[PDB]
Design a protein around this nucleic acid. Structure first.
Ligand code: K
Ligand code: K
Ligand code: K
Ligand code: MG
Ligand code: MG
Length: 136
RNA sequence: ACAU
DNA sequence: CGATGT
């Protein structure tokens, strides 16, 4: 502890897993929604959590912001660190769109630099991350 | 077991 | 109850 309030918080929302995936980023202090991705018809929770972090990195870099990013996803934080999303989701026609976005997110990571700290939101201590969809 |  | 991941 404690919370770094000067930060961006991201989270995925889904209908089914695998299922319809969306994500959003919010100002941790105020909850102001800063970006929201259009729903993707089929994806996994972890793909969406991964895309949300990468989008946050791109959003902050474009704005010359040094704020950290909070995510509640152990998996996606590691995938971003590794620059490699190790998803089990079948690559087929139904999943082509999500897999294109994930491939493109990995590609951006491998062609850009950033100093943004990517931090674990401590749900057990602090409650739900501020970007949560409130579906559970 | 942990995190979603 | 189920699924995605380390
Ligand atoms: K939720
Ligand atoms: K959670
Ligand atoms: K499990
Ligand atoms: Mg989450
Ligand atoms: Mg959530």
């Amino acid at each position: 502890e404690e919370i770094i309030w000067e930060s961006l918080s991201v989270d995925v929302g889904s209908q089914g897993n695998p299922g319809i995936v969306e994500y959003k980023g919010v100002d941790t202090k105020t909850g102001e929604v800063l970006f929201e991705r259009e729903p993707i018809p089929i994806g996994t929770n972890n793909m969406g959590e991964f895309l949300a972090i990468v989008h946050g990195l791109r959003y902050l870099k474009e704005r010359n912001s040094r704020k950290p990013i909070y995510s509640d996803s152990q998996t996606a934080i590691k995938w971003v660190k590794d620059k490699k999303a190790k998803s089990t989701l079948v690559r087929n026609e139904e999943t082509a769109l999500i897999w294109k976005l994930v491939d493109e997110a990995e590609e951006w990571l491998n062609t850009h630099t950033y100093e943004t700290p990517i931090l674990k939101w401590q749900t057990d201590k602090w409650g739900e991350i501020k970007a949560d969809y409130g579906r559970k």
